[PDB]
Amino acid sequence: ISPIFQGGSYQLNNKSIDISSLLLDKLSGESQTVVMKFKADKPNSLQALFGLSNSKAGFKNNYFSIFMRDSGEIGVEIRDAQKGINYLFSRPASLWGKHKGQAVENTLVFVSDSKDKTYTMYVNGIEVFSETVDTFLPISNINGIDKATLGAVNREGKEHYLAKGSIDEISLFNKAISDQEVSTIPLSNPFQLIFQSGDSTQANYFRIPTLYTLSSGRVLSSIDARYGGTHDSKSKINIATSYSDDNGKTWSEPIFAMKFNDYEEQLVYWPRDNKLKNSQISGSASFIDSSIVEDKKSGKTILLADVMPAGIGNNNANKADSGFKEINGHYYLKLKKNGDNDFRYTVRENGVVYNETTNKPTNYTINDKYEVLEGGKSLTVEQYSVDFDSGSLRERHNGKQVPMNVFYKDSLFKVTPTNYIAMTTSQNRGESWEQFKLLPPFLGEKHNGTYLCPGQGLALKSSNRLIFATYTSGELTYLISDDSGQTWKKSSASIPFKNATAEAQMVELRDGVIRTFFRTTTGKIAYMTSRDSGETWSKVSYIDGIQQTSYGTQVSAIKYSQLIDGKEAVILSTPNSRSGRKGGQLVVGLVNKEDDSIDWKYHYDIDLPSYGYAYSAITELPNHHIGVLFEKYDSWSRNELHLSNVVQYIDLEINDLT
């Protein structure tokens, strides 16, 4: 159907615009849709874009509004004091402000559906909330409504929630348009989605993006596909990948690089209320924090990620146990059998499960997928599914049998409850992945594994050397391979931090010279340098001119292929803020070839200083553009948990940055 009202080119300059005459007598029936294309690149702290109110004395709480905050939050209020209704629905981190320094046209669609008693908001083609109520309040059924307003709400004759921005286009319909019809509304998005709710992963949430440009020109991305809300492990999380063959313009349907099947892959709307938002899938194995590198010699792609057995994360991982036993100068994975109080088994050569108490081998073996076989026969466990049907999280058997894996809660044989690092490879540039293998311990039997630094590994340009950074208490632990990742050694680099999440990413400044940039607890990004391809490392220095919070955020970095202002250039991606994960920037640094110091010369604002920006991935695309895949929200804030479609991708050119 066509609109009952349509208007545009409204400038909101801290002065409301009255459209009562045009709109109020057009409103009819109990269902409505608002479609609004608007810009706000310098919003007030809290502002209303659109309002329908009773402006009379004594009815200040009788109004409908669409409002936004300078945090990027969008929402509505639907209020009628006589009816005793005060609805407030909203979602943080739903908006764009600026892109390439120009104000972004956001497309907002609000559907008020009396038949289904549901209010649904979309912004930029993304559903940010859908709320069903027992007692529906039609937006123009508010008692005594007498004003329709742009850029404020008229309460008792005065302008509340005054806005700064513009509404280029606004249409209203006397119908609740379908989700199908919404999908046909043209958008002006500055961004793309690679991974998204409803795709092949069936994860409703994503975190920890990576990007890496392959020698063929294919661009590969990996990510945490997070099922139980956006929580770090313990949860259910798989590692998923997607690639682009056209410089980032389009992306393949995701596949899994690493996955467990003890729990179903379920698209769940995780509760965001204060009572339930910390609900956590507590019995599932999971992966977390992936990193990618390409090996020139073999041509293989290599992906590592942390691995957690059922119920396990950072919080509860057995520190002081690697989960391996040394026997002869070799490391074997330890196992505990159903009913034992200790770990009396090891996985020796050829997956053979071996009893340590009696040095006797068993009739159990572990196959390549870490699955348990008895006498060559595949053992199984029943899968779990999760739901909130009861008002709290339940994890229960779903009737389906899956291969028994030693990382599972229901397995006859279990690994040590600690964190491991797994490796997989692809021989077809991400079209499929091999079954993962655990990496051996690097810091000894009685040390839990290090934590992988998410993002990219480093393939030195002049050799076959591959490096993945990892971190642990007191050091960075670089993992080095010269044989296509068949064998690894460590190179330890002391840092003056205990228990830091020292997520580190590397650039090769020139042949053999590596600078690593890393997250700290000091509010500054740190760096160190190797001049011998990672064998030894300098002391730690800090970057001035960029601020992070006390807790820090992952930083991504690349060495750009082209000179800028006649100099070798490095580009860093990070929030720039001492307050929260917001104020995203790409910072272009020029290398002083006299001493390899870096002059951080250009700061490019990804979006508003107040809009969210957390973990990120950057890559130089084959056409010399820059691709950025990043968490567009504050992934620390306890107010912005469990948001869908906030990991987003943009394309930039160097002239945009400088």
Which string of x and - marks every residue 398-437 that binds ligand IJ4 (by CB under 6 A)?
---------------------x------------------
Q: Pick one of 270, 343, 345, 451: the residue that binds ligand IJ4 (CB under 6 A).
A: 451
Question: After which residues do gaps appear in the chain, with C to N over 2.5 Å?
Answer: none
Q: From the CB of 205, what's the least distance to ligand IJ4, in Å?
A: 13
Q: Looking at residue 457, what DSSP letter applies? A: -
212 is catalytic: no
Amino acid identity, position 184 = T
User: Binding of ligand IJ4 at residue 635 (CB under 6 A)?
Assistant: yes
Secondary structure class of 68 (helix, strand, coil): strand
Integer Cα distance of 415 and 309 in angstroms: 7
Contact window for ligand IJ4 (CB under 6 A) among 308-316, 321-329, 333-341, 432-440? 308-316
Nearest to 24 by CA among 6, 7, 5: 5
What are the E-state strand segments in 309-433? 324-326, 331-337, 345-347, 352-355, 360-366, 372-374, 377-378, 380-387, 394-403, 413-414, 420-426
Q: Pick one of 127, 224, 232, 294: the residue that binds ligand IJ4 (CB under 6 A).
A: 232
Q: Are the CB atoms for 599 and 641 separated by under 8 Å?
A: no
Q: From the CB of 553, what's the least distance to ligand IJ4, in Å?
A: 7
Q: From the CB of 151, what's the least distance to ligand IJ4, in Å?
A: 36
* 465 assigned ligand-binding residue: no
Write b or e for each residue in 40-57: b if 16 or more Cβ atoms lie within 10 A of its Cβ, otherwise e: bbebbeebbbbbbbbbbe
Contact window for ligand IJ4 (CB under 6 A) among 254-262, 305-313, 488-496, 533-541? 305-313
Q: From the CB of 387, what's the least distance to ligand IJ4, in Å?
A: 24
Write out the two tokens for 2: 């066509």
Of 615, 640, 649, 651, the active-site residue reads: 615
C-alpha distances in Å from residue 125, one per residue of 116, 187, 590, 645: 21, 7, 38, 10
User: Binding of ligand IJ4 at residue 5 (CB under 6 A)?
Assistant: no
Contact window for ligand IJ4 (CB under 6 A) among 50-58, 176-184, 261-269, 306-314? 306-314
Q: How many residues bind ligand IJ4 (CB under 6 A)?
A: 13
Q: What are phi and psi of 531, to 5 degrees?
A: -115, 15
503 is catalytic: yes
- For ligand IJ4, the closer of residues 252 and 521 by Cβ is 521
Of 503, 607, 631, 640, the active-site residue reads: 503
Which string of x and - marks every residue 268-297 that binds ligand IJ4 (by CB under 6 A)?
--------------------xx--------
615 is catalytic: yes
Q: What are phi and psi of 532, to 5 degrees?
A: -135, 45
Q: What are phi and psi of 203, to 5 degrees?
A: -90, 135
* 519 assigned ligand-binding residue: yes
Integer Cα distance of 61 and 78 in angstroms: 9
Q: From the CB of 400, what's the least distance to ligand IJ4, in Å?
A: 27
- For ligand IJ4, the closer of residues 5 and 551 by Cβ is 551
Residues 6+ apart with CB under 8 A from 388: 268, 271, 276, 279, 394
User: Binding of ligand IJ4 at residue 631 (CB under 6 A)?
Assistant: no
Of 73, 77, 232, 306, the active-site residue reads: 232
Q: Pick one of 308, 458, 459, 654: the residue that binds ligand IJ4 (CB under 6 A).
A: 308
Binding site feature residues: 207, 519, 581
Binding site feature residues for substrate: 207, 519, 581
Query: Which residues form the catalytic set?
Result: 232, 503, 615
Binding site residues, ligand IJ4, CB under 6 A: 232-233, 288-289, 306, 308, 313-314, 419, 451, 501, 635-636
